[PDB]
Symmetry: D2
Subunit: 142 residues, 4 copies
């Protein structure tokens, strides 16, 4: 049975809606195991300003909260309880997505292109890197 990785930005509503049907259809093929991953971004820029368990809340705290929101989001998908798993990481979202894709390993990554906006973007920062560097199939959802 295949493995599908579904990266979720917990701050995105519309994106999460569009991937739901795709994720559901994809898992109904092969009875796939679906792994959801949300990544707490860590910015060098903020570090360089001095903003660190100090001016920013504890990482253990942030993770529990992110994980909490991810599990709320996973309830929006019709997937067998036995086939789903939630993951939280910290770092560059693209690197951690790609790392998780190597770790599982993933047969497919399902990822939204970019938040809907009035800019003329192609792919988002993270979608483009995943598409480019993943070693498995990537479904870019629009």
């Amino acid at each position: 049975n295949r493995t599908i990785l579904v990266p979720i930005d917990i701050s995105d509503s519309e994106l999460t809606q569009r991937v739901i049907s795709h994720v559901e259809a994809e898992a109904k093929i092969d009875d796939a195991k679906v792994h959801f991953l949300t990544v707490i971004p860590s910015l060098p820029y903020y570090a360089s300003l001095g903003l660190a368990s100090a001016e920013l809340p504890a990482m253990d705290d942030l993770k529990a909260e992110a994980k909490s929101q991810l599990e709320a989001i996973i309830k929006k998908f019709n997937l067998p309880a036995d086939r789903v798993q939630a993951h939280v990481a910290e770092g560059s979202p693209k690197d951690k997505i790609l790392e998780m894709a190597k770790k599982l390993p993933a047969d497919m990554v399902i990822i939204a292109s970019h938040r809907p906006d009035i800019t003329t973007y192609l792919l988002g920062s993270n979608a483009a890197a995943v598409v480019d560097h993943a070693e498995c199939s990537v479904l870019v959802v629009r």
Copy 2:
């Protein structure tokens, strides 16, 4: 529902992986699958005095030759005859693909990342452009 599957006739030995994705996606819905091959037309060759119906063959004969090869490829897929259509175009492959996706319109484009090649998991020129510019979901198959 409409799936567009671009085919480069010089990669006739498709992976089971690509065939499998298309068959599976088509089964999810009652989807029509449109296959498209594009005869590339190069300004560089025009600049060298290589013109259609002169030192290159007539475009119509090239179209028929391409379409004939596409039809042999289409049959590799286990799809009902009434849910499959063959298209041949000429020009810039990325732009004709994107044009077709817009015309139909496609709900999904299924495209191989790159011909099997041990050097890279990176996208080829057409895959990269299609993933970037399609207005619909794009599955990049590896």
Copy 3:
């Protein structure tokens, strides 16, 4: 006389070193005006965790600090005092870089590709978007 935009991530040392010579050579042509821009990233993800002049320091504060570090960095370039200007913004670095490129308007953007790392990146998140969407020439420094 032309206008050159030089985006600076204040947390990057190596990148800033490599662009120095390019920026200097480029400005010696045309006696260009050189505008430096550093952008305080604002992350939806952090907002969605609750982290806002509250759990994160005042934006006025962050800006003064970023601007301070930018001016320290601008001292590493041999440019006429009359030809340089420092800017700070807040938001998506790529959007604000691109906006500044439209606002000046910029004749050239000089931007490092990506921090040197042992990952096999092509361009960074922001370099790629600038390259892709800027309406002027872009010098991608490596």
Copy 4:
């Protein structure tokens, strides 16, 4: 110092902007400027039974024709004869460019984004690949 300037002979009417960038970059240093044109070789055409020295002309004659056109283009640049070299290759233009950049090696590649075209400021297929994969600095001219 070595500058590589890829030339597509079917865009012979270069912008003053491209010529200006190359001249200026070469003057900064005492730089040698290598110009390269690549005769594209398409698997798709091979698949249609179009082979060199049969239904296409001999590669040597195509090489000589291309080189002759390149040399006329090279002369548009105001460069000293001893700091300029012409190269013709055959195959995938993006890969031969990148190969040349590696071989020389190039300290900089100067490349137009795309032929002048009112539809887009986005990169063409070769420019995009070259900016992404060159190991050296790349100036994308618009």
